């Protein structure tokens, strides 16, 4: 997270950490708890090649990584069939937990938007995670969860910005309709935030607008971050998460 501060301890109860086996269970990717048995994340964190489920665990909302680990096993991985790379699209995946989570004040689900919500500019949105804090350098060894508030851009204005300083012809769509753009040169997601939730407060209710997907480096000029647009995939999500 570039910009912003340590998150308050109550504020984002749905945030998830994905851990890979090694010399220790290391954080590699974000996610969000959307149902007591289901985590929503990005597809490029887990695919397109198939992963052994022995090597993966889920950690629920810590304040600090590694300090108080309780590692949940994963029963199933479901990657959207259209995915192969994040710039093509469909960068969305589901994890089914082996055991259901006991919902609590400290652990609660986020709400998914109704398909009609478009999230125009001016929507108050935040992104959270344990990624890198500047373009080249790691989150320091206390490892606090960080938050930042980010401005939304319209897709056409965002696609135009990606053509500045590029050879790509203006007729070629870089930013697709399954995508969303947010952030600026001071305020962005970075490496290790991928798969984490973008949430906007609408009529008092927190809704997940997006999943951190890809970009041309952290906080670079004219290169806003690209998010997977959650409304585009609601029908695919509801084939598995029982609503």
């Amino acid at each position: 997270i570039v910009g912003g501060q340590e998150a308050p301890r109550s504020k984002w109860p749905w945030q998830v950490s994905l851990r890979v086996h090694g010399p220790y269970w290391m954080h590699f990717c974000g996610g969000s708890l959307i149902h007591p048995q289901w985590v929503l994340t990005a597809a490029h964190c887990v695919g397109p090649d198939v992963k052994d489920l022995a090597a993966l665990r889920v950690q629920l909302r810590e304040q600090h990584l590694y300090y108080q680990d309780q590692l949940l096993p994963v029963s199933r991985i479901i990657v959207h069939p259209q995915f192969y790379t994040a710039q093509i699209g469909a960068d969305i995946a589901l994890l089914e937990l082996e055991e259901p989570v006991n919902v609590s004040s400290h652990v609660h689900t986020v709400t998914l938007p109704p398909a009609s919500e478009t999230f125009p500019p001016g929507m108050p949105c935040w992104v959270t995670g344990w990624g890198d804090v500047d373009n080249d350098e790691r989150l320091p060894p206390p490892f606090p969860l960080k938050q930042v508030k980010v401005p939304i851009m319209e897709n056409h204005i965002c696609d135009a910005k990606y053509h500045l300083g590029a050879y790509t012809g203006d007729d070629v769509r870089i930013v697709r309709d399954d995508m969303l753009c947010a952030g600026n040169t001071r305020r962005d997601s970075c490496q290790g935030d991928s798969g984490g939730p973008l949430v906007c407060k609408v009529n008092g209710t927190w809704l997940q607008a997006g999943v951190v997907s890809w970009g041309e480096g952290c906080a670079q000029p004219n290169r806003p971050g690209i998010y997977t647009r959650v409304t585009y995939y609601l029908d695919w999500i509801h084939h598995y998460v029982p609503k």
Partner: antibody
Amino acid sequence: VQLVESGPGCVKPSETLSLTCTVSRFSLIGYAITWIRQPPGKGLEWIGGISSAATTFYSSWAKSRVTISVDTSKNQFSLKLSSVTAADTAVYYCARDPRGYGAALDRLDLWGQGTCVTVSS
Amino acid sequence: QMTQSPSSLSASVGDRVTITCQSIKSVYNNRLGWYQQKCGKAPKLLIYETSILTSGVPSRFSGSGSGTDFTLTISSLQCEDFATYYCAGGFDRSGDTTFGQGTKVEIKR
């Protein structure tokens, strides 16, 4: 990386059997342990296990009498079986599931060598 | 719950054999494995997830099964293959999981 059981070998009726499984180097932080029993001349029967989340699961018969627990300060897993009958005479094993599932038998990748326990007067 | 068949077999060195295991429910999501047990030893995992061969196992062994019926096959029995073999399966999460009865294999010489 290997598992070692420990236990009394010989026990008197109505005692409570205590077993411990110890992990020798590194730690099972993200791992499950299950307990397996083999009475003389039978096949394998499952007692129970503990998941990576510290959830516990017990068989159809074991819920009456068995408790399983973990102590990270010792790198130890423990089994207790109350009110033992002679029919509790068996070899007992601890085994690891590498996926961390607390109620699974299809992928027990690492086993101890086992402790035999005889119950007699 | 499961029934494993046959209870015993005996065959030549070099011979081609298979073991079958069947159940009244299908396994939850390929959760079936095969274990080998030898003269006073802990079981060793040979096959997991219906068909994945455990590393270090010689490619004599393979298995697969139609979701409710499962086979383990040995292409050419060695005397080193003298053992009991068990299927194990899992039918949900938390609930029904069990071993089979186990098959005893003697090698004729």
